[PDB]
Design a binder for this molecule. Sequence first.
Ligand SMILES: *CC(=O)Nc1ccc2sc3ccccc3c(=O)c2c1
Length: 105
Amino acid sequence: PKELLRAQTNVILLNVLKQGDNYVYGIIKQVKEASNGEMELNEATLYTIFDRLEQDGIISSYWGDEGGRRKYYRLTEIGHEHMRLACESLSRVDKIIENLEANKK
Ligand SMILES: *CC(=O)Nc1ccc2sc3ccccc3c(=O)c2c1
């Protein structure tokens, strides 16, 4: 349903941040270019997501230099562990699926 895909939006949003702090206009078109023009994100959509992650302490926000105000987001410490738990969660279920295709023939 929808909470597999929202579980996938965070894991890639958690990775344009893993590789340098960034703002949204940049994050937005950094995932559009990463998506060959297929994953177009909204400003309002991204913000609600980052607010939740920021409340849960998965990312934090700070300001830039000048000029004009500009909110930047960075991967926090416990956001680093989550990103690799979702990674170690692939390591199991990806061999579990093949072992199930093996326990037949
Ligand atoms: C590090 C790593 O392997 N991370 C990773 C790769 C691919 C996926 S696919 C996916 C799809 C839908 C929801 C979640 C989801 C993942 O957590 C990962 C994680």
